[PDB]
Amino acid sequence: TATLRPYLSAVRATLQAALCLENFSSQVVERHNKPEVEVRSSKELLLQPVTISRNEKEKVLIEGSINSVRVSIAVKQADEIEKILCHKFMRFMMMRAENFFILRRKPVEGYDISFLITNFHTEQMYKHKLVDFVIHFMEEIDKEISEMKLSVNARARIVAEEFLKNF
Amino acid sequence: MPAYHSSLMDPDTKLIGNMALLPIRSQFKGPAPRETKDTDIVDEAIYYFKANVFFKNYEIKNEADRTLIYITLYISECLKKLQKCNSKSQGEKEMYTLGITNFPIPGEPGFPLNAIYAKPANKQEDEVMRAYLQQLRQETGLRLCEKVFDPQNDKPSKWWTCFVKRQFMNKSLSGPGQ
Amino acid sequence: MDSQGRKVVVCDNGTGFVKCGYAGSNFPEHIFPALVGRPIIRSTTKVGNIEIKDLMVGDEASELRSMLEVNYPMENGIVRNWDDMKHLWDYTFGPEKLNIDTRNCKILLTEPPMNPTKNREKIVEVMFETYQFSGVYVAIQAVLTLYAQGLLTGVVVDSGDGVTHICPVYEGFSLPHLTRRLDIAGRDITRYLIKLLLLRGYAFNHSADFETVRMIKEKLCYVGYNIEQEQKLALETTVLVESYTLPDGRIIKVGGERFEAPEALFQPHLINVEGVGVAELLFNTIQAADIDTRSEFYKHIVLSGGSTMYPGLPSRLERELKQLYLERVLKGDVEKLSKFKIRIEDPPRRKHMVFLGGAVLADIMKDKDNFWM
Amino acid sequence: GRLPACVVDCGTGYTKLGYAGNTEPQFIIPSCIAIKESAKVGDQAQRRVMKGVDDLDFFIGDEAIEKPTYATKWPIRHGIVEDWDLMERFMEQVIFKYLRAEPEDHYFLLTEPPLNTPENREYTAEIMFESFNVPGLYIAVQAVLALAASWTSRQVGERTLTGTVIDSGDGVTHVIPVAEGYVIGSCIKHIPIAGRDITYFIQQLLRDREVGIPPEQSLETAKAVKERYSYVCPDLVKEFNKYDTDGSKWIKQYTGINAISKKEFSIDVGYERFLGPEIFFHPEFANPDFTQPISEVVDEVIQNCPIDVRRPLYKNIVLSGGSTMFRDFGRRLQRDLKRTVDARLKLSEELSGGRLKPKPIDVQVITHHMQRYAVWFGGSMLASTPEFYQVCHTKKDYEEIGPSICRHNPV
Amino acid sequence: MAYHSFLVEPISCHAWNKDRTQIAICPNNHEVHIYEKSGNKWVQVHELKEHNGQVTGIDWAPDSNRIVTCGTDRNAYVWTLKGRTWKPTLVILRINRAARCVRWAPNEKKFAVGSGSRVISICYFEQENDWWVCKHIKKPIRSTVLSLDWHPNSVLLAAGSCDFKCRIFSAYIKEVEERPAPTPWGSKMPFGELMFESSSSCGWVHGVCFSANGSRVAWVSHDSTVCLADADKKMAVATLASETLPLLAVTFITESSLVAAGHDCFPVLFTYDSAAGKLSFGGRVSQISVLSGGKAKCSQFCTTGMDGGMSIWD
Amino acid sequence: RFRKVDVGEEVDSCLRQGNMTAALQAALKNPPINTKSQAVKDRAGSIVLKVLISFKANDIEKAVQSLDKNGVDLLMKYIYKGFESPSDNSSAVLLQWHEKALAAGGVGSIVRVLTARKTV
């Protein structure tokens, strides 16, 4: 229902306001330094979580803190075959969360993938290029899904001829 | 660890310099006297050579090791030349031509182990170093000529030439350059 | 200082670090590792122009370790190479570093408790048979903490490089039978960290490498506050992964090993040692004490020694004691625990063998120092 | 169940396949896969990525060692699986072609090299449960199986259940102590010296001396001389003196066949024979940064074990994996240990004035015919038991938890 | 303006020598480095190594010429130039959590360290034991303290809490001062008296500053507001809502105009109307300090950011 | 053992009056922000999203521009409420208000939504 260009622009601006991190040594352990969004041990360091949504299926949650922000996405599963392709796409990507440095090794329940951005990343990597990555991820993922669907048809169509032809 | 360290450092032996001055058995001339027993520091470096070059680490256990590591490097330099020799007779004279070359003395720059050898402080050590280190080389060459050239054809023997590529802890007596 | 103008020095003789200063100084002047070593040729290294002595010692032997086969003369508090031990002191008092260079000035020694008696006595020999010192004393390593902290009652937890000790002191009385040792100290945590990085495919094996994983340990490691929370944050998210640069410039990466290694202090069974973790060995010590003294030990836990520096260790330690007291004293009467006043002295200054109380408050001039006899 | 379980042991040199209960592995094959190749059609636009059904044109095992038109790949290195794409293609063809097993109806026992990271135990479990729908998997410690192979083979009067096993396969050597059926996990040591690096050392040592070896076949001949002529010697420098003086006869000849021209070629075989096996005793010959002789690594293990089990461990050292087959390899390790142990007791004699003489430790190093497959044969005798079927993870457990059911390991 | 980059990584805090000819900056590590104006370029001259963790605050006492530094190490040290070497000095900070901020008072006899311990520690020197000893302002603090600024009287201390509120406390140490002169923020001031507290309830306060006439404070808040509060009026606050990103640092530049910087990475400017109390925005990362002229009439200022380096302005 | 047991813890009359901009100006009169109430917060949104969906695109520009700065900040909090459970197509309209509202309020009007400690 909602078109792509207005929806993406809204997510960009919100995420630009949330990416305002600073370093913060924790209050509740002697000198540990940890992302407040994950440990949630303090509860005045947390920002109000906000959702942007294109329709009832596609939405983004932006959830910030003085030193960290978490972004979690859900994508339109347009048919049964696409659920399986999508889930496995995430797993093989998420399996390299040590190279996608902003990526959590697990999604949030009810979300398909989720990024944890700490102050160290926004100090060590160009902020506007991380946001461009998150936007680019949404610009492509349903093209990248559909391309596998076209190829999975082709594989089966070859396998059928390879069996039937030898009769 | 268990590399072959120098055996001969009996404390009754004189110990001139930063290295064991030792009684090099030769008909050449120098500051060191003549050993009479059948075993000697040049024979020791020759004997242990094929083993020593594989050990990638080597301590200085005593002063005689700072001799032995230098004899080993010169032995390698012998092979770097004898391998080219067309016959044993050339392998002798073209070895003497190497012995009387101006090798960097350990305190001189361009020697590879300047961290490990102290400077010779005065002429009566420095000139002793010139007259000792040549007496090492002059003898060391004449001993390899007899046993690198296997007697059937004065080929430089293959087994020895294998070691031409291998250098004792990858240090070279060519220094930073010849 | 002395009315004779003599100076007085403290040596911690530490199993890993010798630590030296003059009496009354709030700081040591020199901290340096106890390494002693000989030059060794190595294929993997270019031999420099830097001169290597036939025996490097101390700080120099640490920076030039890449050329050196290095020993520790001290192991687990017992001298195991007495010749390198002499050479380490001969370096300490020589022209280099703490240049007293003399017999006339006094030295304090610190010995661990429950120390094999011959170890103590050989030190007292060489101090008078070799340096011919004018004044020497051997102090109970545990009491020096409370002198520096300015206390008289409390239980001293003293995790050095070699061995961990717990020693109660009550209003200045030594209670010896409540001494305990735990054989987990900074050295074992280092070797255990080597093994943890070996699983991640980094090989460290030279003696020169041991100092490198120590420098890793000191900068990246920490003790988990709620070990379940650390494990979930490792499993769920990447933030624990952090880089380090080895001497050759390999940009190695280390992860949950940052907390899995220090945890061995609370779980000796992760290493081969069978026993109880520091918190529970501390709790059993207090519980063995005579019943009225326990009320004060809970309020005056005192921390000493570099292996207590790990981020969060005071917080982790306090949690295990509160939970132990809930489980075994209040018998799960949870809400009562608001009454359990417990406090840990964890002052950020914690090379806690400073000398002020032990020297100047003990003698400006006195018959206490042992003397040539 | 009625159908037997599969036992699939994968090493970095070889893999070993068969159903449980057999006495002996039904396939021994090299751990190699030969994928299809192209004239730079794979490039910066896309590397080794296939389309349609082009990915299924490949082979594994000896069917892949000698095919001309394919690029040979070796997925397992230092025992660890390095490229799971090739390993999964390898596993499929093992199951659906070599074993003929239907994965949905046979339990699998599959082997862990004691070094491997937990992530690799997740990924290997993800294969069998989520790719193949195996009904249940178990991941076995290779060393404990090797001990069980000795245990069932050796005489019932000495079935000690206690010993140190040395498992020098290819990849990495493990030294592992087991006391009365429990792995002492704290004491396990890894030595990087293994059959590959002994091969590589011999390969370099030849290629410097003996050029004439064709580049396609350097590796084959290096393996041959390692297997056929190499031995652990009595004293390193004393061999060099014997090889100089009796060079007429300690030197040997190997004749190879040129794979392309079918001309023969010959090489003189010499110092290669005793260098190599002595890399276990002088690891710095092959690695910059390991130096303890194997005869002194094994001592440190026992000396870290609990005081009661120490002597029994010396009484029963078991040799496992192919590289331990070298001539005299047992004799020398026993001599070095014996010379170390009784000298250690000589100290404690003097610290007690000779007032009491300790009962000297006897040391035994034991060679047995299973050595080429003791890991699989142990695996088969385990997976036969009705107990085994309950130690395995049932597939539902992979559904309720994640793949994390294989995070745990006994180290 | 001009720009220079000292390092790739964040310059977490800076301080200046009295005559500005040197700066101290922390290279995102457990040290502080001092640079000298050797030409246009900067030369590193000294290196203070003693901390055991990342430092997060510096102030370089102008006349006393001594540097205070604190950080997550919890330790703070005051550094004396004992000849050609800076030597540290112990401070018995009783804090149990990470230190976060430090500033010297104008009389240079005391300083204060903020921390995550939910306290401010005021410090003064014991002569008899060579260390600096602390007293804590502790009562209405309830979250970490992010920024400190000292009133011209060296007694009143404004403090930005991560508690959505800006507070002013009398840090009157009787061991160091006569009872302080009367002030519009209130004549009643023992140690730890609560002089003022912001009306709002949202957004962390990153920065606070006192005008050179102490009657106006302004503070800068993560809800993208700058506020100024006036003691010539009855402590009346006025707030400007703005369309910028959050601002991290603020300082006065005249008695009635103000300057700030933040996550937009550029300076911005405000004026304060004495009549209506209305602020206004004039426009144009992590610190601002006036280089010449103080808060009475600024003529240059410096800014250092996480993006690296410092800038100097007009 | 021990370490297991954790310790340490009116609008319709303006709409149908045609100048429906006057309704939205009235809809901002009912903020529940300060209250502890929760059922009222569910009422507050429904009274506004019914208004937001009524506008023609010829007006949604001025309907923002006629607000004060508080009005825009007030509006953005209602916008981020409808996204939490869209109607069958109403996201198509909220994203169109968002375009206008963010043009007037800038990203600063978002930040004091993220930091808003009490909300409608």
Ligand SMILES: Nc1ncnc2c1ncn2[C@@H]1O[C@H](COP(=O)(O)OP(=O)(O)O)[C@@H](O)[C@H]1O
């Ligand atoms: N900041 C630190 N964090 C963790 N470990 C440290 C730190 N500083 C020192 N250590 C460790 O503490 C040990 C040395 O402590 P020390 O008190 O000097 O022992 P000893 O006095 O017995 O030699 C070493 O293992 C060293 O690595």
Ligand SMILES: Nc1ncnc2c1ncn2[C@@H]1O[C@H](COP(=O)(O)OP(=O)(O)O)[C@@H](O)[C@H]1O
């Ligand atoms: N006669 C032999 N002497 C010494 N080593 C051998 C001999 N035959 C085979 N080998 C070694 O045994 C290895 C066989 O594989 P193995 O090590 O048993 O399994 P894995 O691949 O699991 O390590 C060969 O790679 C080779 O290195």
Ligand SMILES: [Mg+2]
């Ligand atoms: Mg100590």
Ligand SMILES: [Mg+2]
């Ligand atoms: Mg194997």
